[PDB]
Structure 1
Amino acid sequence: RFLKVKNWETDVVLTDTLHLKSTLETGCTEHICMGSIMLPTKDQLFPLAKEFLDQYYSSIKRFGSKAHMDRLEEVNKEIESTSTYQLKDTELIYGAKHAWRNASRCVGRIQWSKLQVFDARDCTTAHGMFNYICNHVKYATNKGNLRSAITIFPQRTDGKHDFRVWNSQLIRYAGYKQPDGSTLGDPANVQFTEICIQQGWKAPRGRFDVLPLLLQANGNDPELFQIPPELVLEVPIRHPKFDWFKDLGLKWYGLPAVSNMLLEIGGLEFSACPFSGWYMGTEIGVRDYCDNSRYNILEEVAKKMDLDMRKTSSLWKDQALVEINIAVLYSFQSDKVTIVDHHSATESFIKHMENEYRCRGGCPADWVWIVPPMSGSITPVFHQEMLNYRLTPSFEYQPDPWNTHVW
C-alpha cells in the first residue's frame, strides 16, 4: 500500500504514497500489464467537484475553513440547480497547472507551476477562437524565448455544443499522397490535410506547408483560418560540421502546442485547451525526422555521410541519428529559439521527481514515454523506477472530431 521506487544507478529509494489518491484506471490488471499500449450527469459530478475543491482549499492552507465550506455549498447549490458549475479563476488556474503536474508522460514537469493560463471561457465563435489562438501563439513564442501557456475554451455542456480544435497541434505540416505512390510532407497528417482541402483550404502542395486551423465553436461545423505566417516561427536545420546538411532543405517549427486533448478539472471537461511549451531536441531529430512513418530521412543523411550502409552492424543508422540530433539542437540554439537536449531534460526530471516525492509523496511517471527515444541508458531516467497512475486534474486523449462530428 506504501510503495518503494529505486534508482538502480544511485541506490536512492523513494516512498510513494500519492498513488493512494489515484482515481482513474490504468489498463493493467494483476494478470496483465498494458504499460506499452498507447491508448489503454448530476450524481457523478458533485463527488468530482468535492474532491477537487478539497484539494484546492488544502493547497491554499484553508482546508475546513468557512470559505472552503461555503464554496462546496455554492457549487452544490449550482450543480443541483444548473446540472453543471463554473470554476473561479483561481480554481481554473490551479486545475490547469495540476493537470500538467499530473501528466505522467511529460518529462518537462519541473516547469509545471510556471504556466500562463489564458481564460477563453467567454469565447462564443470560431473567429474568436482564432483570435485567442493567435494571441497564445504570439505570447508563447515571444520571439524565440518560449513561455509555457494554455488557452482554455468553454467547458462541455450537453456535449452537442463542444468546442474543439480539429488540429492535433496548433502548428504542423501538411501531408499529401502522390500519384507517385510516395508521400509529400508529413505522412502523419495526410488524413487531416484531406479534411482541410475538402473543407476549402487551397493547399500549396509543398513539403512543409503549415496547416490551417480547423476550429469548432459551440458544436458548430468547424471553420478554416490561416495562422498569420509571421506568427509561426520556424528554424532552418543546419549542422555545425557538415556544410552539406542545409541542402537537405529541412526546417521545423519552434512551438510545440498540443491542441487535441481534453482537460478535466473537478469533473468539468474542457474539450479545447491548446497548450504549449518548448521542444526537447529528440522529438524533432529522432521522431519527426527519423521514424519510418514520418519524414524518414535516415537513408538520405547516411548517404551524404558516406557511411557503409551494407550491414546493420556498422551502426550507420545510429551514426546518422546522432548527427541529425546535433543539427536540430545547433539550429535552434543558433537562432535563439528555446530547446532542451535529452540529457538536460531528463536530469531536470529526476530533480523534479525528488522534489515531488519530498513535497507531495510521489510523482506519477510513465517510463515508456519519459525515457528518450535515443541513448536511453545514458540518461538518468532509464535507471529510475517509476510508478504510473492517474490523478485528476488531467489531460486525456479524446477521439478525433471528424469521427464524432455530425455535419
Structure 2
Amino acid sequence: QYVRIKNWGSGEILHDTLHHKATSDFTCKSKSCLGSIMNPKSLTRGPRDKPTPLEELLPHAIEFINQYYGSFKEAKIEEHLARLEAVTKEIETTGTYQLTLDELIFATKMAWRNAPRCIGRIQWSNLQVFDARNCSTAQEMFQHICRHILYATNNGNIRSAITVFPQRSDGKHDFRLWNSQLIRYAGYQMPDGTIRGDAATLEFTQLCIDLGWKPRYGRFDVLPLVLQADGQDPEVFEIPPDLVLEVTMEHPKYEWFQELGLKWYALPAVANMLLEVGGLEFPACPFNGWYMGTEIGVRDFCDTQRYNILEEVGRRMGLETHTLASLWKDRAVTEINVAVLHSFQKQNVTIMDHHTASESFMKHMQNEYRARGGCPADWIWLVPPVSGSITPVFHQEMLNYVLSPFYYYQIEPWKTHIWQN
C-alpha cells in the first residue's frame, strides 16, 4: 500500500503512496535500471498528426477537473458538477476543450510541483502565469517572450514565470520555441580550428546562421529566438540586448579573476518543454525561476565540453595542475563557485548556492509527504554537481515517477518538422 523511504542521515522513514497516481511505464524495466539516462522516452511527449482520441481525452479531462476542484479549502460541488458537464459537452461538440485561466494557473503550478528533476520546488505556488493561448503569429510569440524576459528579469530581482501559448490542436499547428532555453550563448567553430563561445550550441548556432542570423563571433553572443507558430516554418528574432541582464564574474580576493573576462546571463529559462494537463498538450510554454550557483560555476564554466576554464583557474592559483591527487580541481572549482555567487550578489542579482537549495528541497519534500504522501524526485538530478554528500539531499532515498500535470521533453523540432518551403 506504500513504498518505504529512508533518510540515512536522520534515520527518518517516510511512506510513499502518491506513486499510485503514476502514469504509464517509467524509465527502468523490470530487470534493469536506466535511471542515469538523460532523455528516456518515458519523459518525452512526441508529436501527433491527428487530434487526441476522445476516448482517451475525456477520462483525463474528468480527472483533472476533479483534481482542480478537490484542491479548494471549502468545496464547491455545484461549480464542480457544472464544470464537469461543460467540459464533457465542449469535448463532444469540439473534440477538445479549453481550460479556464484559474485551471491553467493551477496546472502550471502542479506540473512544476510534479517535476522530479527540479530542486527549487518549495517555490511551486509562487509563479506568474502569462496567458498567450490567443497567440497566432511568430511576431506575437516574440512580443510575449520579450514581456516574459522583462518581467522575470525585473532588473536583477528575479521572478518565476511561465508563458503558455496555444495548445496543440491536430498536431499540425504546433507553436514551438526551437531554442532549448530563452537566453543562451552562441558557439562558433573558428577558422583556426578552435571553438569560440559555448561549444554546446555549435549546431543550433549554425542553424540560426542558416536561417539568416548574423554571427557576431564573440565569446558571449546571445543567440536569437527561433519561433514556430501555428505549425509554420520557424522565424528568427534577435533578443533586444536591453532585455538580457548579465553578471560580470569577479572573485572577492583574486583580482586576476576578472582578467578571465567571464560573465553569464541572469535568467534561467527552459524554452523547449511541453505542458501536459487533463489530456491537453501545450508544446510551447517557456518558464523560469532563478539560478543555483553550481549550474554556472560548475557546469557552464567547468564542464570540459563547455567553457572549460578549470585548468586556467588552477594555474592562476599556483596549484599542481599536473597531479590529480593534489586535488587542485576541487580547490579550483570552489573558487569559481565563490566567484559566481560573489558576483551575482555584488551586482544585486538573485541567485542561490547549492547548500541552501538542498536544505530548501528537504523541507519541501517533507512538506509534500505530509501534504500528499509523496514527492516525485530524481536523486540523480537533485544532488548538486559538487559537494554531494555534504548536502542533505544525498542521504535521502527517493521515488521517481511521472504524475499529471507534467512537464515533458519533446523531440527536437528540426527532426520532425515539415518545411513549407
The answer on 1:48 being equivalent to 2:33 is: no
Kindly report which structure 2 residues correspond to 1:314-329, keeping only aligned pairs within 5 A, or say none.
314-329=326-341
Q: Deviations over 1:7-39 (max 9, x none)?
A: 101111111111111113211123111111112
Letter in 2 for 1:318: D
The answer on 1:58 being equivalent to 2:105 is: no
Matched with 2:17 is 17
Matched with 1:106 is 118
Matched with 2:127 is 115
Q: Is the 8 A contact 1:24 1:391 kept in 2?
A: no
Q: Is the 8 A contact 1:54 1:63 kept in 2?
A: no
Matched with 2:227 is 215
CA distance in structure 1 between the partners assigned to 2:141 and 2:260 by the alignment: 36
Kindly report which structure 2 residues correspond to 1:178-257, keeping only aligned pairs within 5 A, or say none.
178-257=190-269
Partner of 1:150, secondary structure, is strand
CA distance in structure 2 between the partners assigned to 1:62 and 1:192 by the alignment: 50
Find the partner of 1:281 among 277, 284, 293. Answer: 293
Letter in 2 for 1:121: R
Q: Is the 8 A contact 1:169 1:256 kept in 2?
A: yes
Q: Is the 8 A contact 1:144 1:337 kept in 2?
A: yes
Deviation at 1:64, TM superposition (A): 8.0
Listed as ranges, the gaps of 5+ residues in structure 1 are: none
CA distance in structure 2 between the partners assigned to 1:304 and 1:5 by the alignment: 45
Partner of 1:340, secondary structure, is coil
Partner of 1:279, secondary structure, is coil
Letter in 2 for 1:352: H
The answer on 1:310 being equivalent to 2:330 is: no
CA distance in structure 1 between the partners assigned to 2:56 and 2:191 by the alignment: 52
Partner of 1:211, secondary structure, is coil
Q: Deviations over 1:195-236 (max 9, x none)?
A: 111110111111100011111110011111111101100000
TM-score using structure 1 length: 0.98
Kindly report which structure 2 residues correspond to 1:5-404, keeping only aligned pairs within 5 A, or say none.
5-40=5-40, 41-61=53-73, 65-404=77-416
Q: Is the 8 A contact 1:26 1:390 kept in 2?
A: yes
Listed as ranges, the gaps of 5+ residues in structure 2 are: 41-52
CA distance in structure 2 between the partners assigned to 1:257 and 1:338 by the alignment: 14
Letter in 1 for 2:246: E
Deviation at 1:345, TM superposition (A): 0.3
Partner of 1:339, secondary structure, is coil
CA distance in structure 2 between the partners assigned to 1:282 and 1:350 by the alignment: 18
Letter in 2 for 1:157: S
CA RMSD of aligned residues (A): 1.1
Letter in 2 for 1:115: L
TM-score using structure 2 length: 0.95
Q: Deviations over 1:135-171 (max 9, x none)?
A: 1101111110000000000000011110011111110
Deviating 4+ runs (over 6 angstroms):
none
CA distance in structure 2 between the partners assigned to 1:72 and 1:174 by the alignment: 48
Q: Which moved more, 1:241-250 or 1:27-36?
A: 27-36
Partner of 2:152, secondary structure, is helix
Partner of 1:215, secondary structure, is strand
CA distance in structure 1 between the partners assigned to 2:237 and 2:129 by the alignment: 23
Q: Deviations over 1:353-380 (max 9, x none)?
A: 1110011111110000000000100000
Letter in 2 for 1:24: S
Letter in 1 for 2:189: K
Deviation at 1:50, TM superposition (A): 1.1
Of all paired residues, the percent bearing the same amino acid is: 65
How many residues align? The count is: 407
Deviation at 1:282, TM superposition (A): 0.3
Partner of 1:59, secondary structure, is coil
CA distance in structure 1 between the partners assigned to 2:259 and 2:322 by the alignment: 24
CA distance in structure 2 between the partners assigned to 1:38 and 1:17 by the alignment: 26
